[PDB]
Structures are given as structure tokens and as C-alpha cells.
């Protein structure tokens, strides 16, 4: 069961996939390859909830039904360097304009 994700930090969004059976730790290894920060310098979140490295993505509620190619689920990302922890902060995307009269 593939799961499709947006990993978001500040004004950065990574599109990637994993399995429901993938661990949170294994997702950090995916992020490491892209962003070059090791798993122990990463914190991953689902909404406000800090995710436990050992738990599977499925156990955290990312399923093939909630994390779809055309509507991926969001994972928050924050970094740590030594004793300094960054807080989770995700900049929202822009907003569409008013719906035109003839729609």
C-alpha cells in the first residue's frame, strides 16, 4: 500500500511516496537524501503531533485512502542542530481569487 506525501517546512514542500508499512524513521532517511540533514536532526509531524520514529506511517494514519497521488497527506518537518530545536512553521500557499461571475 503506497502512501503519497507532501513534507513541508517553511516555504519548502517535498513530494514523495512511501508505504503504509514504512516507519517514520525510514521517511527521515528519504528526507535526508533530498535535504542532506540526517534523521537525528529532523522532527516530523502530523498536524500538531510529533511522530515517533519507530511507528509505521499506517500507524500514524497515513493510508492509501488518506494519502493519495492526487491528494497527498501533509507531514510537517522541523530541524534540530545540537541543543537548538526549531519549531514547526509551515507558510500557507497563496489563495485563489474570487470565483468569476460566470462560474
Amino acid at each position: 500500500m503506497d502512501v503519497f506525501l507532501m513534507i513541508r517546512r517553511h516555504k519548502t514542500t517535498i513530494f514523495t511516496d512511501a508505504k503504509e508499512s514504512s516507519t517514520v524513521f525510514e521517511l527521515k532517511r528519504i528526507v535526508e537524501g533530498i535535504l542532506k540533514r540526517p534523521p537525528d536532526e529532523q522532527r516530523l509531524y502530523k498536524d500538531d503531533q510529533l511522530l515517533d520514529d519507530g511507528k509505521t506511517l499506517g500507524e500514524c494514519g497515513f493510508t492509501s485512502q488518506t494519502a493519495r497521488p492526487q491528494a497527498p497527506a501533509t507531514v510537517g518537518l522541523a530541524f534540530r542542530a545540537d541543543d537548538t530545536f526549531e519549531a514547526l512553521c509551515i507558510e500557507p500557499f497563496s489563495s485563489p481569487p474570487e470565483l468569476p461571475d460566470v462560474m
Binding site: D2, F4, M6, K11, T12, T13, I14, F15, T16, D17, I34, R68, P69, Q70, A71, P72, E91, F93, S94, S95, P96, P97, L99, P100, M103
Partner: protein, 87 residues
């Protein structure tokens, strides 16, 4: 290989190179592994990246394919993006 696609308002989208190459326009712009769009905003470009994931996953797949959803409020700018991107 990942590429970085940057929206008009500065949001960075990191996507598989194979996925971004769905668009011949992006392929040309890549010829850095980053592409700056001058008029595609983040809410549209994020929807375009979902399309790429959908297209690559469901192409050649010989399974039941779900609809690609588009909300009314985004449809007209997404159309313009799709036309520009030829995807």
C-alpha cells in the same frame, strides 16, 4: 534526481525529475536543478505537482483510476498553467 520548482510567490516544490519532465516546458527551462516561474502561484503549482504524481502513478497501470479532482475556485488558473506547461 529531484528538481526544485519555485512559484511566483517563492514557494519551493521539490519533485522527482521524472515527474517534472511530464512538462516539456519544464524540460526546456531545466536545460541548477531549479526552475523559477514568474506567474504561477503556490496554490496552483502545488496542484500541478499533484497532477504529476497522479499521471506517473496511473499511466500504464491497468487498474481502476480515480478522478483527478479540481475545485471550481482553482480551475481557471490551473487551466492557464496547464496550457503554458503543455501537460
Amino acid at each position: 534526481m529531484y528538481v526544485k520548482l519555485i512559484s511566483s510567490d517563492g514557494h519551493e516544490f521539490i519533485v522527482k525529475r521524472e515527474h517534472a519532465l511530464t512538462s516539456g516546458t519544464i524540460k526546456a527551462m531545466l536545460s541548477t536543478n531549479e526552475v523559477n516561474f514568474r506567474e504561477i502561484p503556490s496554490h496552483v503549482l502545488s496542484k500541478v505537482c499533484m497532477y504529476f504524481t497522479y499521471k506517473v502513478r496511473y499511466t500504464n497501470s491497468s487498474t481502476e483510476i480515480p478522478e483527478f479532482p479540481i475545485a471550481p475556485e482553482i480551475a481557471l488558473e490551473l487551466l492557464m498553467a496547464a496550457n503554458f506547461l503543455d501537460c
